[PDB]
Design a protein around this ligand. Sequence first.
Ligand SMILES: Cc1c(-c2ccc(F)cc2)n[nH]c1NC(=O)CS
Ligand SMILES: [Zn+2]
Length: 389
Amino acid sequence: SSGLVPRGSHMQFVNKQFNYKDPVNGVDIAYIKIPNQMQPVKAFKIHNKIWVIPERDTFTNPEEGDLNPPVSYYDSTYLSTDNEKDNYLKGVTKLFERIYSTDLGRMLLTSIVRGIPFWGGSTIDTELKVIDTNCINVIQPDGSYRSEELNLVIIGPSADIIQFECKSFGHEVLNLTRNGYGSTQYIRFSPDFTFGFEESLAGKFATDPAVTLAHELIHAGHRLYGIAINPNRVFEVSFEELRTFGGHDAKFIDSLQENEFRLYYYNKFKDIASTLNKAKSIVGSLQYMKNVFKEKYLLSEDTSGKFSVDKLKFDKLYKMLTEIYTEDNFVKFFKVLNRKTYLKAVFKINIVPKVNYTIYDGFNLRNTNLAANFNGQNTEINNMNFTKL
Ligand SMILES: Cc1c(-c2ccc(F)cc2)n[nH]c1NC(=O)CS
Ligand SMILES: [Zn+2]
């Protein structure tokens, strides 16, 4: 048993208890294509605007179409059988429910779903138009395609199994992750591996994969609202990573440059409001899309129907995405052990069985010897759950 529904009748964020063998529909189980050409891959729609592709990522980058070698870890056989892909799907499902079981996760995932990428694709500055790279192509049961917008795709890692990241497709001129528009995010991630860190409550503990996924989700939050920090602002560690980790590592960032960041994206949101005001037509109703992006960016509307940015609602949204949504704060909500700074070993894991890992407790199963002193995360005490590689 997987323990996917510890309380209630159904999962509270994921829409369905999928099995990889579940037959394809055209709605939430579908063969899909990423806009490059590729052969369709089977995907699962776990939530509004969120899809999961239980495949090794040989699609995102044209230069990473190979799963062989040129701390990293390589294994071309990982995630090549249906049993593995089913376990991947159930593991990702489990972590989303674990994140959504905390108040902070419900806030974060709500923000992610609301952060629809902006319709800034038209070359005519009075027309709203989608950007095709923020969509996937969904195969319908009768063989026809359908273009569907989405915010987030969870896909398996590429050649380097343990290289997780949050990446998205770019624009020839627009910097969608830095101008407030946002773009569909692709998270390379695996629930079947994790990293080990040392701590002296000389114990060798393992990172909780729900923390790692939340870290990537925070990046997606930044990038869906187009308020990411330019990756060239570094320390070598990008400020974007320090902000995501949070805690006292976030304090390394120049406070006054952050106030500079805040004003830079305040003005970007204002330009988005202006574009919404100038919009007279839509390709693909106009007012509805105008209200979609009123909701996302929390814009105010006067008696005239004119949109504008309220400084207080911007600060609240901005502060939520950059200060509150952090790895450090998720560590506190989960009550797990974690490394204290953004900067040893790699372990194979299986979180799907309820007896190995639960939505509420992770590895530290309550009413067991694993409940105390993070013994569940101790790779020696709980050796049954960790195979060193
Ligand atoms: C976060 C992360 C990991 C990771 C961390 C902890 C683990 F237990 C397993 C994997 N591997 N690559 C990245 N990518 C980045 O550092 C920038 S997003
Ligand atoms: Zn990161």
